[PDB]
């Protein structure tokens, strides 16, 4: 089984610039080296025949080029679209295998998430349990912090959260956090808030409701 | 213009085994080619398991091998895959490919997911988020349905019948305490447009064979 290693494993790009990956090889696999272009919940991609021939429907800022033990994949320029995972595979021996991955994060100019907070539905207390949820819109950098406050206290173990993948448009994360909590403590409390500590705010933001 | 598709199961108990049939449409697999199976797990690279030549032809991967044999029904344009012994590891999405010339793979499947677990199948229950109380703002407001304790995974989530794309963010699911999936899909709207417009999410469950649809109002 050959075996292929690519780097970087995570890459973390500005927009319209390039970008480059590289795939070495366990043996000189010759001409016979393809690389594959895996965005989130999709089939892999062909990108590039073996070594660097186009596809009839890749975009010239991709690329590639290599020969023997060494390959190279070249963004020429990156664009939104772009915001994937990328694989390389060889195409010399059986069995077939395929490289460990090449994330590539878009580095977008910082923007701040807008924040929502949803009250839980009057059909799911009757179920005995209550959900809140805290909405992080678009936001970049993914890093932030959510802070939940029922009845200004702060609240632990009680909260699960979820961030989606990187929009190939405006390139920006999404966040939700859900605060689960029993109808009988549920209503045993007034006010409950969602705290929000971005790159992008210059204070803490916290959205909140009552009854 | 060739396409293939992948159906089988979505859950299956460890120490059971694994059943997957892949349906090819535009082209006879009698005639050319030799088709392919390949898994990915969950945040992990992409695995080759074999292939089926057109002449009936089979090899394998070395390893996971023993596990695995991979048989064709010619008459209905398709061609199967058998996994046995399955742990935890096996749970992954299951691909439908075409080896094409020089091994390089120019047609994928849309994918299916197995996933392996003792567990029984549930059964989402699809409650509405309200959107924001100001609508005299005019700016930009946000709904959402929220979809919770299901099993397994996936689910799909479409809003208006697939007529509203635009602005729609479903977040992937997190298992819950209670062992069950859970999600919440949301998209953002102009504030104005509330009363005017109506929002219906699309819910839908293969393993449970489960639609719920939910109109969305303050």
């Known amino acids: 089984e050959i075996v292929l290693t690519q780097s970087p494993d995570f890459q973390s790009v500005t927009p319209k610039e390039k970008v480059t990956i590289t795939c070495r090889a366990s043996?000189?696999?010759?001409?016979?080296l393809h690389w594959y272009q895996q965005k989130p919940d999709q089939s892999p991609k062909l990108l590039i025949k073996?070594?660097?021939h186009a596809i009839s429907g890749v975009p010239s800022r991709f690329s590639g080029s290599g020969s023997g033990t060494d390959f190279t994949l070249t963004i020429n320029s990156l664009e939104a679209e772009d915001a994937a995972t990328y694989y390389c595979q060889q195409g010399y021996d059986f069995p077939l295998t395929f490289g460990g991955g090449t994330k590539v994060e878009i580095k977008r100019t910082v923007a701040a998430p807008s924040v929502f907070i949803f009250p839980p539905s009057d059909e799911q207390l009757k179920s005995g349990t209550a959900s809140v949820v805290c909405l992080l819109n678009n936001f970049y950098p993914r890093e932030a912090k959510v802070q939940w406050k029922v009845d200004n206290a702060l609240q632990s173990g009680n909260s699960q959260e979820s961030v989606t993948e990187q929009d190939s448009k405006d390139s920006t994360y999404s966040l939700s956090s859900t605060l689960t909590l029993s109808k009988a403590d549920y209503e045993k409390h007034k006010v409950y808030a969602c705290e929000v500590t971005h790159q992008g705010l210059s204070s803490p933001v916290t959205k909140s409701f009552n009854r | 213009q060739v396409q293939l598709q992948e159906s089988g199961p979505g859950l299956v108990k460890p120490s059971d085994t694994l059943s997957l049939t892949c349906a090819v449409s535009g082209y006879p697999i009698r005639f050319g080619y030799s088709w392919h199976w390949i898994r990915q797990p969950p945040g992990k690279g992409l695995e080759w398991m074999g292939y089926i030549h057109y002449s009936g032809y089979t090899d394998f991967n070395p390893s996971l091998k023993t596990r695995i044999t991979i048989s064709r029904d010619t008459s209905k344009n398709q061609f199967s895959l058998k996994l046995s012994s399955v742990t935890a590891v096996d749970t992954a999405v299951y691909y439908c490919?075409?080896?094409?010339?020089?091994?390089?793979?120019?047609?994928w499947g849309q994918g299916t997911l197995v996933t392996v677990s003792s567990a029984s199948t549930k059964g989402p229950s699809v409650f509405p988020l309200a959107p924001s109380s100001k609508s005299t703002s005019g700016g930009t407001a946000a709904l959402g349905c929220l979809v919770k304790d299901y099993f397994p995974e996936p689910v799909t989530v479409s809003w208006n019948s697939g007529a509203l794309t635009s602005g729609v963010h479903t977040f992937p699911a997190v298992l819950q305490s209670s062992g069950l999936y859970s999600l919440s899909s949301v998209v953002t709207v102009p504030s104005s447009s509330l009363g005017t417009q109506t929002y219906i999410c699309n819910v839908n469950h293969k393993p449970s064979n489960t639609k719920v649809d939910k109109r969305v109002e303050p």
């Open positions: 073996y070594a660097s």
């Open positions: 043996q000189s696999i010759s001409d016979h």
């Open positions: 490919a075409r080896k094409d010339s020089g091994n390089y793979f120019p047609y």
